[PDB]
């Protein structure tokens, strides 16, 4: 019926404490989604080109050239932390939980409303909105994951984080195949390097369509759609950070002489000369046993080529790295490769009363200390004569290939059988929750964007489209675009995301770091006088844990 509501708005986070210290967390999110009709009812194949930018020698890092199928449909993506948890709930979770499991996910659409804009021809323009009770909203649910997976948080296009603000969906578009060549150059590179877009190789063409691969439900003003509960199987996400590096693994050396009076200069002394110490070292030609040369069980962290660009059929891409930098915690402005930087708009955290289109930005300096500090590690000759000379060492200050600004660490990879690393920490509120595992026979060990990875499947993507509202002059034989009555839709989206977490237990004398309100961040969690809201980034691994 038109006058009977088909659902209830619900945005309450529930905690239900189970046996053995586990907590059943239910995050109900509810939004009002506004949807305009598509620009055109037809699928487009658009080749986006920015050769003007890359035509300038040395700008190869600014390539946006690609090919995309632009579709008339719109994607309703809720794969972002902010959509589910308000700052207080996240504070509770990070301060008192230790591990997080993704349990279930369900979503539904109700109170579908379709309206048409009749723009009067009156000399002073005016427009009246009318309820078209017969219009239909097409809802498609890719339950079988037939369509390409296109997470929205990567582009900051998920639903809004404010329950009391209407949100808009994102027009769905998926990459089409293409070939590209961008020979790197630098300021001073003579001529124009080879920069060509070869087009689409026929063997790799895929042209998906929702109308052909997904059943489509037509919802009038009195209808509702529910996706049913989806159950995850993702690995647990740890809410604790590791501080121990190789230098802090195992039994420390025995201090034969200990300080006698408190002070900043009263250090402990091992006493025994370095060459006469007792231990085990992987270096078989030196008797010097040191805190640096001692044998650790394995390697915590791996050095990777940083700011290295790799070319493939589609052009250049930046090599990802799964660890943060060392010493970047001192200042966010001193961040470097590996620290994820998020840019977001007024829907996703930026002060809602800000003027201008400049996105709000922040670099997330993770609390885990498993990264690398390239200025430190060096290489020296096998003879290990000490002190080393210029001919027997390769310091980070040394050039490679004659380039004064590029040193050896830029092309150094220490990933090996002994490498150990942690999963990506959650980022609030702009961070993604789950991601799909790759279809490759051999699959990546971890993803750099989401902490939870679907082993089998992720929930089907939800697509919404205002059904065509034809005028009486329609003619399919006309090459011109279809004439449509201006129409839009407002519908309420309600989702339930269920987590399971473990409550932390104190295991040390000293307290641990905790998220708290303070005089500096006070006014970042309350509205301004003109209704301005914001959601600042919050750290998710404040509690430490021992690695070995």
């Amino acid at each position: 019926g038109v006058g009977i509501s088909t659902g209830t708005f619900n945005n309450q986070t529930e905690f239900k404490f189970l046996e053995n210290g586990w907590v059943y967390i239910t995050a109900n999110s509810s939004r009002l989604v506004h949807l305009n009709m598509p620009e055109s009812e037809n699928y487009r194949r658009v080749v986006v080109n920015n050769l003007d930018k890359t035509a300038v020698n040395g700008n190869m890092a600014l390539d946006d050239t690609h090919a995309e199928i632009v579709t008339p449909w719109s994607l309703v993506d809720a794969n972002a932390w902010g959509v589910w948890f308000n700052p207080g709930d996240w504070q509770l979770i990070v301060n008192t939980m230790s591990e997080l499991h993704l349990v279930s996910f369900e979503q539904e659409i109700f109170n579908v409303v379709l309206k048409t804009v009749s723009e009067s021809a009156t000399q002073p323009p005016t427009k009246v909105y009318n309820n078209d009770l017969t219009a239909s909203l097409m809802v498609a649910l890719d339950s079988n994951n037939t369509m390409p997976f296109t997470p929205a948080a990567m582009r900051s296009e998920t639903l809004g984080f404010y329950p009391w603000k209407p949100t808009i969906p994102t027009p769905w578009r998926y990459y089409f195949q293409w070939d590209r060549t961008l020979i790197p150059s630098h300021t001073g590179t003579s001529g124009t390097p080879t920069n060509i877009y070869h087009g689409t190789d026929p063997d790799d063409v895929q042209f998906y369509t929702i109308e052909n691969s997904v059943p489509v439900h037509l919802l009038r003003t009195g209808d509702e759609f529910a996706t049913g509960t989806f159950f995850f199987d993702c690995k647990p996400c740890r809410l604790t950070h590791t501080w121990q590096t190789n230098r802090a693994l195992g039994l420390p050396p025995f201090l034969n002489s200990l300080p006698q009076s408190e002070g900043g200069t009263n250090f402990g002394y091992i006493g025994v000369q370095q060459d006469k110490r007792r231990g085990v070292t992987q270096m078989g030609n030196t008797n010097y046993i040191t805190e640096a040369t001692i044998m650790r069980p394995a390697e915590v962290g791996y050095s990777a080529p940083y700011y290295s660009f790799e070319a493939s059929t589609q052009g250049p891409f930046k090599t990802p790295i799964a660890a943060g930098r060392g010493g970047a915690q001192t200042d966010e402005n001193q961040a470097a490769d590996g620290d994820p930087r998020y840019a977001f708009g007024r829907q996703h955290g930026q002060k809602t009363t800000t003027t201008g289109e400049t996105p709000e930005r922040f670099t997330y300096i993770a609390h885990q200390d498993t990264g690398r500090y390239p200025e430190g590690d060096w290489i020296q000759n096998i003879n290990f004569n000490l002190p080393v000379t210029d001919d027997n060492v390769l310091l980070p200050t040394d050039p490679i290939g004659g380039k004064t600004g590029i040193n050896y660490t830029n092309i150094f990879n220490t990933y090996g059988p002994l490498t150990a690393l942690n999963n990506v920490p959650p980022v609030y509120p702009n961070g993604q929750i789950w991601d799909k595992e790759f279809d490759t026979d051999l699959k990546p060990r971890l993803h750099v964007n989401a902490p939870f990875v679907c082993q089998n499947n992720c929930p089907g993507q939800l697509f919404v489209k205002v059904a065509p509202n034809l005028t009486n002059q329609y003619d399919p034989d006309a090459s011109a675009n279809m004439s449509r009555i201006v129409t839009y839709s407002d519908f309420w989206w309600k989702g339930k995301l269920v987590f399971k977490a473990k409550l932390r237990a104190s295991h040390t004398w000293n307290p641990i770091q905790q998220m708290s309100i303070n005089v500096d961040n006070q006014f970042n969690y309350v509205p301004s006088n003109i209704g301005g809201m914001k959601i600042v980034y919050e750290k998710s691994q404040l509690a430490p844990r021992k690695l070995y």
Partner: antibody
Amino acid sequence: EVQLVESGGDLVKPGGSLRLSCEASGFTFSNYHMAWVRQAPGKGLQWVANIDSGGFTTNYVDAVRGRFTVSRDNGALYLQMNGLRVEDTAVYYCATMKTTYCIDENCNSFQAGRGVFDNWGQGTLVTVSS
Amino acid sequence: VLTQKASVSGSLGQTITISCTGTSSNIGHNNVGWYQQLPGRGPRTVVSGTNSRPSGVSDRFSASKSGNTATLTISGLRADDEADYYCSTWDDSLNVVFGGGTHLTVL
């Protein structure tokens, strides 16, 4: 249709300064590299300067190098002229430098390039004398 | 400066050719553009490489490039073709280099 309109041409004294403008409409002005090209009375076309699509780099000819400057504001082009000399008297045009060239008739494949101007403005006359 | 012929002349309906020349190190690797210049008008791009013409340009124009030389062919002269023709390209010294022009004329 693409529209480029120049302005600012006028009589000026030698050794002074001036500002010529090139307003653009009907196309994505920010997606095209732009160029200032001058022609003296009855003489051939002479390249004055050029600027990329983001202002990262600008290039000049030796005759105006160190004297003039070029800038853009996503809506129009500007040429700042300093140390004007008698020979500078000429008509100036703003043209889009074709940054992409397709290599097939339907032009499914395209390549980067330089040295071809696609669209031109109207042009403006600058006279420097007493 | 690229080399060009000062002028040419021909009868109406004749298919004619004009040439622009320069060092292969600059006219070779870079593209070449041909523009028309009528009295009381700014240069109009007639040929933009790959024998492709801008919209609104008569199909009579054609162009080709080989090493030091670039050739522009007109398939049948018309009274409105009496005008200056200008070749331009990029130069590996990071310049934009034009030719001296050629005043096409009709007998």
